[PDB]
Amino acid sequence: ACARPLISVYSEKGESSGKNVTLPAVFKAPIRPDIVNFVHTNLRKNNRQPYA
Amino acid sequence: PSRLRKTRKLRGHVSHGHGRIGKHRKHPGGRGNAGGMHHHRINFDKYHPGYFGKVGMRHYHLKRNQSFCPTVNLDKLWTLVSEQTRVNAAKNKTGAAPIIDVVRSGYYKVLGKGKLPKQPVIVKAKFFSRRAEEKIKGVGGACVLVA
C-alpha cells in the first residue's frame, strides 16, 4: 500500500511524547529475501582471510 | 560451491563418469591447438574458416588514436541536447534553429540512419555522410564542419 502512517516518538521515560513523524517511504519497499540472502552470502565473504 | 557439483553425486562409481573402454588419460589428442592442419583439420575448417594463411598489408607502428572517430546516427541526433531545447525550437515561431554540436558530446562523424523530426537544426560536426547531409537539407537545416 501507498499509505504512510504517523509514527509517534517515545520519550526516554517510555511514554509517548507529543512529537510524531510520518513513516519514511523506505519501510514500504518490497521485501525480497532472495536479494537479501544473495547479498549477504556474497558479502560475508569479503572479510575473510586467506589460508593455504 | 562443492556441494552442488557433479563430483559429489559421482562418488562410488568407479570410472568417475569417464568410461571403462576409453579411460581419462592425460592428453589423447595433443596439447592446446595441436594438429590444426593434420588431425583436427575437419573441426578447424568446419568451425573456424580462414584460420590459416595471411592477408592484407602490415602496419608497423599502429596508433589507434589517429583513427579514433566515433559515430552518431540521426535518430539519436536529437538526444544530444535536452528535451526542453527541442520543444522550445518546436513551438518557436521566429524560425530560429537550435545548434547541436556532436564534438562537444564526443562524436566526430554523423551518419544518417533514422527518420528526422520536421524542424530546422544546425548540426555542426567534423565529418558528414552524403545521406545524413541530404536528410538534414530535406528536413531544413544546416551542416557545419569544425576541425
Binding site: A1, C2, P24, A25, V26, K28, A29, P30 | -
Partner: protein, 52 residues
C-alpha cells in the same frame, strides 16, 4: 527518507537513487480472490469426488 528518497522524490544524499519499483501493489491475495468483480467471472467449483 533523505537517504533513500521517497516514491516521487529522489534521494538527496545519493547521486541518483530511488526506491525499487513494486512488482505487485495489492499483495492481499485474499481480497484479490474475494472481490466481486473477479468472483463474477468464474465457473462453478466442481468439488465432488469421483472415486474408481
Amino acid at each position: 527518507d533523505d537517504l533513500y528518497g521517497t516514491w516521487r522524490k529522489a534521494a538527496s544524499l545519493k547521486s541518483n537513487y530511488n526506491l525499487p519499483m513494486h512488482k505487485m501493489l495489492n499483495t492481499d491475495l485474499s481480497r484479490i480472490l474475494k472481490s466481486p468483480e473477479i468472483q463474477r467471472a468464474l465457473r462453478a467449483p466442481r468439488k465432488k469426488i469421483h472415486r474408481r
